[PDB]
Amino acid sequence: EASNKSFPRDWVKTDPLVPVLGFAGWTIPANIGVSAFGGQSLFGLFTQSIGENLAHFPTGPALDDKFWLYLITYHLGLFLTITLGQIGVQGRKQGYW
């Protein structure tokens, strides 16, 4: 490493467009209703469960709630979309292809 003498402070080359665009690229397809959810959506059912579990705020969700499935799947896709958007943006600006 002939470069990197002082650990640049901008180690994450931040683009504020990246989180917004990953969020919109995931949640908008996640707002498409499909046959498997009974016509509903993943984000729709996730927010529905968020509401149903905020109706008793202290009491957390159960093991049999289905809020955890929506949570984990939604955030799998969302984190993947956000990190791949950051990677793609900073590879486009930089080299990498």
Binding site: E1, N4, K5, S6, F7, R9, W11, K13, Q94, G95
Partner: protein, 61 residues
């Protein structure tokens, strides 16, 4: 393919610490610098008082 993150410590590749986000991220460096352990100009008795309050409060739980 620019912009590598992990650097040698203070640019010295032979001291052997490898500055890194977990080490030298400005949020992390700030938080660790503001801890009473690293307030080198403040009297040690008062830093000890703060550290002790924190630890006695936490280890009672």
């Amino acid at each position: 393919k620019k912009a590598q993150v992990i650097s040698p410590v203070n640019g010295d590749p032979f001291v052997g610490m490898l500055e890194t986000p977990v080490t030298s991220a400005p949020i992390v460096a700030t938080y660790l610098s503001n801890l009473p352990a690293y307030r080198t100009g403040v009297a040690p008795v008062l830093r000890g008082v703060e550290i002790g309050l924190a630890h006695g409060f936490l280890l009672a739980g």
